[PDB]
Scaffold this active site. Structure first.
Site, PDB file in Angstrom:
ATOM      1  CG  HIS A  11       1.885 -17.274 -22.098  1.00 10.49           C
ATOM      2  ND1 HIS A  11       2.267 -18.703 -21.327  1.00 10.49           N
ATOM      3  CD2 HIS A  11       2.977 -16.720 -21.292  1.00 10.49           C
ATOM      4  CE1 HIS A  11       3.256 -18.835 -20.638  1.00 10.49           C
ATOM      5  NE2 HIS A  11       3.482 -17.627 -20.539  1.00 10.49           N
ATOM      6  CG  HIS A  30      -3.789 -19.962 -29.131  1.00 13.20           C
ATOM      7  ND1 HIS A  30      -3.345 -21.215 -29.593  1.00 13.20           N
ATOM      8  CD2 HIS A  30      -2.783 -18.966 -29.963  1.00 13.20           C
ATOM      9  CE1 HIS A  30      -2.258 -21.063 -30.353  1.00 13.20           C
ATOM     10  NE2 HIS A  30      -1.910 -19.836 -30.476  1.00 13.20           N
ATOM     11  CG  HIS A  77      -0.862 -14.760 -30.942  1.00 16.13           C
ATOM     12  ND1 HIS A  77      -0.025 -15.095 -29.947  1.00 16.13           N
ATOM     13  CD2 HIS A  77      -1.221 -15.951 -31.409  1.00 16.13           C
ATOM     14  CE1 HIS A  77       0.407 -16.390 -29.935  1.00 16.13           C
ATOM     15  NE2 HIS A  77      -0.311 -16.940 -30.888  1.00 16.13           N
ATOM     16  CD  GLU A 131       2.170 -14.893 -32.818  1.00 18.71           C
ATOM     17  OE1 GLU A 131       2.090 -16.081 -33.294  1.00 18.71           O
ATOM     18  OE2 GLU A 131       3.012 -14.492 -31.770  1.00 18.71           O
ATOM     19  CG  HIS A 140      -2.264 -18.933 -34.236  1.00 17.55           C
ATOM     20  ND1 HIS A 140      -1.049 -18.731 -33.444  1.00 17.55           N
ATOM     21  CD2 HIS A 140      -1.919 -18.473 -35.457  1.00 17.55           C
ATOM     22  CE1 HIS A 140      -0.398 -17.892 -34.272  1.00 17.55           C
ATOM     23  NE2 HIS A 140      -0.774 -17.779 -35.531  1.00 17.55           N
ATOM     24  CB  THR A 153       4.801 -17.967 -32.598  1.00 18.70           C
ATOM     25  OG1 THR A 153       3.364 -17.883 -32.036  1.00 18.70           O
ATOM     26  CG2 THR A 153       4.362 -18.223 -34.291  1.00 18.70           C
TER      27      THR A 153
HETATM   28  N1  LIG Z   1       1.165 -19.983 -31.309  1.00 21.21           N
HETATM   29  S1  LIG Z   1       1.679 -21.564 -31.719  1.00 21.21           S
HETATM   30  O1  LIG Z   1       2.683 -21.679 -32.588  1.00 21.21           O
HETATM   31  O2  LIG Z   1       0.335 -21.830 -32.621  1.00 21.21           O
HETATM   32  C1  LIG Z   1       1.521 -22.428 -30.531  1.00 21.21           C
HETATM   33  C2  LIG Z   1       0.891 -23.549 -30.403  1.00 21.21           C
HETATM   34  C3  LIG Z   1       0.963 -24.580 -29.374  1.00 21.21           C
HETATM   35  C4  LIG Z   1       1.687 -24.343 -28.231  1.00 21.21           C
HETATM   36  C5  LIG Z   1       2.676 -23.162 -28.422  1.00 21.21           C
HETATM   37  C6  LIG Z   1       2.422 -22.060 -29.466  1.00 21.21           C
HETATM   38 ZN   LIG Z   2      -0.332 -18.801 -31.478  1.00 17.34          ZN
END
Ligand SMILES: NS(=O)(=O)c1ccccc1
Ligand SMILES: [Zn+2]
EC number: 4.2.1.1
Length: 258
Positions: free
Chosen positions: A62, A92, A94, A104, A117, A196
């Protein structure tokens, strides 16, 4: 089959397996800068990353995660809207297929090229899996990326991506300093929200920085060479791995600045 970002399994489908997708505090949202309320009682953020210990980088199908040792108080976030101490577990991104989309969160409906993030969990809950079950379990620091000059502190990440092209691959990734990914200002907006991606749990205090970082066209092009698929499967480029803005409902976005 399972969730993703395609026509047949993307964000509009997630509610069938994860009904909380239509809940009361979903993320991301549009940040309407004129409607956000300055809250002079909000503290400066305290970002303490000097002792951070990175371990590994993973393509999870992902996005890719740079993971940290979170078994001690090594890299922590505190202050701002937060009560207590939150430990860095991973970061990570997006991103989009085009420079005009990929973030996002949006700002007055503006989309940035990507969003970083930095994920942290509340130490009063003992570990990440317990934290995600709590309304104040996580704090995610969100940072917008625009395309312009290169970010030198990002280059070590970009260079390892060839070694984790496909889903399930990992690589050693020690001694990475996440302080090299931060903008100059720590001015922010904050609101209560959710993960998210599935499972879309409503456990996040979101802290989104006002100042974006700039990365180069070449840097983001390398993100777009990653794959969603496993090795030996049909190639699908890992691009457009963002959820669109969700309704604000009964929430107010607060600003740390005027
Ligand atoms: N994209 S996010 O909300 O930072 C996220 C963080 C940890 C697990 C799944 C999603
Ligand atoms: Zn994220």
């Amino acid at each position: 089959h399972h969730w993703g970002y395609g026509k047949h399994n993307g964000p509009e489908h997630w509610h069938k397996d994860f009904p909380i997708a239509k809940g009361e505090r979903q993320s991301p949202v549009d940040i309407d800068t004129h409607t956000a309320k300055y809250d002079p009682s909000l503290k400066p953020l305290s970002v303490s990353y000097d002792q951070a210990t990175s371990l590994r980088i993973l393509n999870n199908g992902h996005a890719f995660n740079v993971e940290f040792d979170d078994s001690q108080d090594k890299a922590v976030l505190k202050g701002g809207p937060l009560d207590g101490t939150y430990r860095l577990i991973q970061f990570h991104f997006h991103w989009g297929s085009l420079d005009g989309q990929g973030s996002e969160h949006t700002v007055d409906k503006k989309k940035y090229a990507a969003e970083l993030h930095l994920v942290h969990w509340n130490t009063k809950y003992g570990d990440f899996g317990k934290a995600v079950q709590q309304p104040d379990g996580l704090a995610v620091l969100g940072i917008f990326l625009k395309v312009g000059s290169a970010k030198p502190g990002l280059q070590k990440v970009v260079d390892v991506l060839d070694s984790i092209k496909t889903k399930g691959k990992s690589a050693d990734f020690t001694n990475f300093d996440p302080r090299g990914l931060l903008p100059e200002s720590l001015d922010y907006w904050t609101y209560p929200g959710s993960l998210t991606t599935p499972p879309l749990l409503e456990c996040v205090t979101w802290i989104v920085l006002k100042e974006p970082i700039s990365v180069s066209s070449e840097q983001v092009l390398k993100f777009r060479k990653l794959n969603f698929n496993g090795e030996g499967e049909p190639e699908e480029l890992m691009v457009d791995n963002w959820r669109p803005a969700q309704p604000l409902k009964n929430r107010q976005i607060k600003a740390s600045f005027k």
